[PDB]
Design an enzyme around this catalytic site. Structure first.
Site, PDB file in Angstrom:
ATOM      1  N   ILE A  58      73.359  29.221 105.027  1.00 43.22           N
ATOM      2  CA  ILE A  58      73.738  27.882 105.480  1.00 43.22           C
ATOM      3  C   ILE A  58      72.539  27.189 106.161  1.00 43.22           C
ATOM      4  CG2 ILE A  58      75.211  26.733 107.234  1.00 43.22           C
ATOM      5  CD1 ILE A  58      77.465  28.858 106.349  1.00 43.22           C
ATOM      6  N   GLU A  64      78.499  33.307 114.068  1.00 43.22           N
ATOM      7  CA  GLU A  64      78.378  32.346 115.153  1.00 43.22           C
ATOM      8  C   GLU A  64      77.317  32.734 116.189  1.00 43.22           C
ATOM      9  OE1 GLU A  64      81.669  31.407 118.106  1.00 43.22           O
ATOM     10  OE2 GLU A  64      80.959  29.355 117.752  1.00 43.22           O
ATOM     11  N   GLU A  65      77.332  34.002 116.624  1.00 42.47           N
ATOM     12  CA  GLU A  65      76.429  34.484 117.655  1.00 42.47           C
ATOM     13  C   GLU A  65      75.011  34.398 117.173  1.00 42.47           C
ATOM     14  OE1 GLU A  65      79.177  36.223 116.676  1.00 42.47           O
ATOM     15  OE2 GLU A  65      80.453  36.392 118.458  1.00 42.47           O
ATOM     16  N   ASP A 110      79.859  26.484 111.478  1.00 40.19           N
ATOM     17  CA  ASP A 110      79.738  27.595 112.408  1.00 40.19           C
ATOM     18  C   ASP A 110      81.144  28.227 112.387  1.00 40.19           C
ATOM     19  OD1 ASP A 110      79.542  29.239 114.708  1.00 40.19           O
ATOM     20  OD2 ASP A 110      80.234  27.626 115.977  1.00 40.19           O
ATOM     21  N   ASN A 168      82.426  32.137 103.526  1.00 46.57           N
ATOM     22  CA  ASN A 168      83.642  32.918 103.851  1.00 46.57           C
ATOM     23  C   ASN A 168      84.029  32.899 105.350  1.00 46.57           C
ATOM     24  OD1 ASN A 168      83.321  33.669 101.067  1.00 46.57           O
ATOM     25  ND2 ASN A 168      82.353  35.596 101.637  1.00 46.57           N
ATOM     26  N   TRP A 169      84.697  31.821 105.775  1.00 44.31           N
ATOM     27  CA  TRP A 169      85.185  31.497 107.128  1.00 44.31           C
ATOM     28  C   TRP A 169      86.374  32.372 107.541  1.00 44.31           C
ATOM     29  CZ3 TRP A 169      89.102  27.010 107.827  1.00 44.31           C
ATOM     30  CH2 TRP A 169      89.288  26.705 109.182  1.00 44.31           C
ATOM     31  N   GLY A 170      86.278  33.011 108.709  1.00 45.39           N
ATOM     32  CA  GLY A 170      87.332  33.873 109.257  1.00 45.39           C
ATOM     33  C   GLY A 170      87.659  35.158 108.508  1.00 45.39           C
ATOM     34  N   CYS A 171      86.679  35.684 107.767  1.00 44.92           N
ATOM     35  CA  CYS A 171      86.744  36.906 106.956  1.00 44.92           C
ATOM     36  C   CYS A 171      86.710  38.182 107.821  1.00 44.92           C
ATOM     37  CB  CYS A 171      85.567  36.900 105.988  1.00 44.92           C
ATOM     38  SG  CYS A 171      83.967  37.096 106.815  1.00 44.92           S
ATOM     39  N   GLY A 172      86.872  39.334 107.152  1.00 38.62           N
ATOM     40  CA  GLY A 172      86.750  40.667 107.740  1.00 38.62           C
ATOM     41  C   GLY A 172      87.642  40.974 108.923  1.00 38.62           C
ATOM     42  N   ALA A 173      87.033  41.030 110.131  1.00 41.45           N
ATOM     43  CA  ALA A 173      87.689  41.356 111.404  1.00 41.45           C
ATOM     44  C   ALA A 173      88.854  40.430 111.763  1.00 41.45           C
ATOM     45  CB  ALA A 173      86.667  41.390 112.538  1.00 41.45           C
TER      46      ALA A 173
HETATM   47  C1  7JC Z   1      80.979  38.886 101.602  1.00 46.69           C
HETATM   48  C2  7JC Z   1      80.812  38.450 103.009  1.00 46.69           C
HETATM   49  N1  7JC Z   1      81.514  37.489 103.595  1.00 46.69           N
HETATM   50  C3  7JC Z   1      81.094  37.350 104.911  1.00 46.69           C
HETATM   51  C4  7JC Z   1      80.107  38.186 105.340  1.00 46.69           C
HETATM   52  C5  7JC Z   1      79.458  38.231 106.696  1.00 46.69           C
HETATM   53  N2  7JC Z   1      78.123  37.644 106.678  1.00 46.69           N
HETATM   54  C6  7JC Z   1      77.999  36.280 106.987  1.00 46.69           C
HETATM   55  O1  7JC Z   1      78.971  35.650 107.318  1.00 46.69           O
HETATM   56  C7  7JC Z   1      76.633  35.741 106.863  1.00 46.69           C
HETATM   57  C8  7JC Z   1      76.403  34.417 107.165  1.00 46.69           C
HETATM   58  C9  7JC Z   1      75.106  33.896 107.025  1.00 46.69           C
HETATM   59  S1  7JC Z   1      74.793  32.220 107.436  1.00 46.69           S
HETATM   60  O2  7JC Z   1      74.169  31.589 106.315  1.00 46.69           O
HETATM   61  O3  7JC Z   1      76.006  31.668 107.960  1.00 46.69           O
HETATM   62  N3  7JC Z   1      73.652  32.237 108.566  1.00 46.69           N
HETATM   63  C10 7JC Z   1      73.803  32.632 109.995  1.00 46.69           C
HETATM   64  C11 7JC Z   1      74.093  34.110 110.202  1.00 46.69           C
HETATM   65  C12 7JC Z   1      74.430  31.597 110.873  1.00 46.69           C
HETATM   66  C13 7JC Z   1      72.956  31.890 110.980  1.00 46.69           C
HETATM   67  C14 7JC Z   1      74.041  34.729 106.694  1.00 46.69           C
HETATM   68  C15 7JC Z   1      74.280  36.030 106.375  1.00 46.69           C
HETATM   69  C16 7JC Z   1      75.556  36.576 106.470  1.00 46.69           C
HETATM   70  N4  7JC Z   1      75.814  37.924 106.183  1.00 46.69           N
HETATM   71  C17 7JC Z   1      74.713  38.804 105.777  1.00 46.69           C
HETATM   72  C18 7JC Z   1      77.078  38.479 106.255  1.00 46.69           C
HETATM   73  O4  7JC Z   1      77.273  39.648 106.016  1.00 46.69           O
HETATM   74  S2  7JC Z   1      79.651  39.227 104.038  1.00 46.69           S
END
Ligand code: 7JC
Length: 506
Positions: free
Chosen positions: A271, A300-301, A282, A414-419
């Site tokens: 992003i 976010e962090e 975010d 992928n917003w609000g995924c995993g945990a």
């Molecule tokens: C298949 C998945 N869906 C979610 C997952 C979690 N995740 C992310 O959300 C993710 C988000 C970014 S980003 O472009 O949003 N850049 C920031 C981190 C804000 C600076 C970059 C890498 C990510 N990586 C490796 C990841 O693992 S992995």
């Protein structure tokens, strides 16, 4: 296997190019401006407005550490600001000196605040010369900018409270003085676990960053000291705007006749790098910044660490309600990183090449939208929960008054995924529907998931070719809940296969 699908990214709207010339910057009832607008010039440090420190110690403004009302009982009320100046104006040569200085004006937490990560960073992570540079140059420069607070932040900062539609525009230099204070844990009334006044506000003082033995604490500290070293060595010259936005009127989704907008979906890129000039999402916690000042190290962090000016939103941003978002314009990127969560590492300093708009703000717009946490997978398909996510994304995407031709694409993923237990395929459709209602195109990052990229693309192309409106798609989501979730006790069929069957057999 193609790395991206849909509309070419070059065809997508970016800023400040696709975003009209700004109106005159000026303070008003809904806009706090803490600098001299008449003196604002490119490459010049902005002058604070008013000239002399003006204090407000009440329930509607930030309680400043330099306030004459910031008092402490003496065995007679003593000045906490004088105590802070005395404590911080000492040479530090060992980590214990810094711990002892911070605790002089935080006596009630001398047994509660752990400093293990700070002590380990300084003694067990840094080489001799790096430790020497930290205590001989970085920490004294941070103390001096923290203690300049009454000359820098002369105007009371209003709290962006629940249901307020208000903006604060301040200088990056003002932000640096405030963040140096949060590092030294000087903000009063922001510490007690049983506090009421700021119980609905995120933590601002950085004490939790100094606790424990997580291998990620040295990485967070390197990232933050990279920022502090940069902003104390050369005063930043731009401005940053923080806008709390709360919508009263939400669409009647089932009746929405808007078609879907354009989509660029990719499993590569980020992003922040590939979403330049676009509205950047975010994936926020309801308390903005989440665990940035403590243990968190997810999307976010990480953004809050590499763009530390975002951190100051925690000083004045009350917990977000369902119909609210926070829009931040102008934050600068000071660091580069690798990895994520337990693999996150600070890489090097970053020289931000973003252009500045007419208010001297970096052309980077970030919106904080908090997804719901689902205790059970099936909970998210409940219509009330789906309408909640649509309304949250819609609030983050809508710019009331602005025309569609002047709106950049939304850069999300992928917003609000995993945990948080969010289904990626449902959340992608929700964001696509919200962006369509707000009349914006979507740039979607799947972060290495190539199968998800193909699925989102195929679903988007299937609905658009068939001319399905936002309303038509929303009704399909309601049918999925009713056929596969409401009566389900254990779903039998996944969402996208359901939609394909429902549309192709009708
Ligand atoms: C298949 C998945 N869906 C979610 C997952 C979690 N995740 C992310 O959300 C993710 C988000 C970014 S980003 O472009 O949003 N850049 C920031 C981190 C804000 C600076 C970059 C890498 C990510 N990586 C490796 C990841 O693992 S992995």
């Amino acid at each position: 296997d193609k790395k991206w699908l849909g509309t070419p990214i070059e065809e997508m709207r970016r800023m400040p190019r696709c975003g009209i010339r700004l109106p005159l910057l000026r303070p008003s009832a809904n806009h706090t401006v803490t600098i001299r607008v008449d003196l604002l010039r490119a490459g010049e440090v902005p002058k604070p407005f008013p000239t002399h420190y003006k204090d407000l110690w009440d329930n509607k403004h930030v309680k400043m550490p330099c306030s004459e009302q910031n008092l402490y009982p003496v065995e007679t009320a003593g000045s906490r600001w004088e105590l802070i100046q005395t404590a911080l104006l000492n040479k530090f040569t060992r980590p214990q000196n810094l711990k002892d200085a911070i605790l002089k004006y935080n006596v009630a937490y001398s047994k509660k605040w752990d400093f293990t990560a700070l002590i380990d960073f300084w003694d067990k992570v840094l080489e001799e010369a790096e430790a020497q540079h930290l205590y001989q140059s970085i920490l004294p420069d941070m103390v001096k900018i923290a203690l300049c607070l009454p000359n820098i932040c002369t105007q009371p900062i209003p709290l962006l409270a629940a249901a307020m539609n208000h903006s604060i525009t301040m200088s990056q230099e003002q932000i640096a003085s405030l963040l140096a204070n949060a590092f030294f844990c000087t903000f009063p009334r922001r510490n007690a676990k049983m506090k009421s006044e700021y119980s609905s506000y995120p933590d601002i003082n950085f004490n939790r960053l100094f606790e424990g033995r997580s291998s990620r604490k040295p990485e967070k500290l390197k990232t933050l000291f990279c920022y502090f070293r940069r902003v104390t060595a050369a005063a930043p010259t731009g401005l940053v705007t923080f806008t709390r936005q709360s919508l009263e009127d939400f669409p009647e989704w089932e009746r929405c006749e808007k078609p879907l907008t354009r989509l660029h979906v990719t499993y590569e890129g980020t992003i922040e790098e590939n979403g330049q000039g676009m509205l950047q999402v975010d994936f926020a916690n309801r308390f903005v910044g989440g665990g940035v000042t403590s243990a968190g190290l997810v999307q976010e962090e990480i953004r809050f660490l590499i763009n530390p000016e975002l951190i100051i939103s925690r000083l004045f941003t009350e917990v977000l309600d369902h119909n609210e978002c926070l829009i931040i314009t102008g934050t600068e990127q000071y660091s580069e990183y690798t990895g994520y969560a337990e693999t996150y590492r600070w890489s090097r300093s970053h020289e931000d090449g973003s252009e500045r708009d007419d208010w001297q703000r970096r052309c980077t717009e970030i919106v904080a939208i908090d997804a719901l946490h689902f205790r059970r997978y099936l909970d998210q398909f409940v219509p009330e929960k789906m309408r909640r996510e649509l309304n949250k994304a819609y609030c983050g995407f809508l710019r009331p008054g602005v025309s569609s031709e002047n709106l950049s694409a939304v850069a999300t993923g992928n917003w609000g995924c995993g945990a948080f237990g969010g289904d990626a395929r449902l959340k992608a459709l929700i964001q696509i529907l919200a962006a369509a209602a707000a009349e914006r195109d979507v740039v979607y990052f799947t972060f290495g998931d190539s199968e998800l990229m193909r699925d989102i693309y195929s679903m988007h192309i299937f609905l658009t070719e068939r001319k399905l409106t936002v309303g038509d798609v929303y009704k399909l989501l309601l049918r999925y809940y009713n056929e596969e979730c409401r009566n389900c006790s254990t779903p039998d069929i996944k969402l996208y296969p359901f939609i394909y069957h429902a549309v192709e057999s009708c």
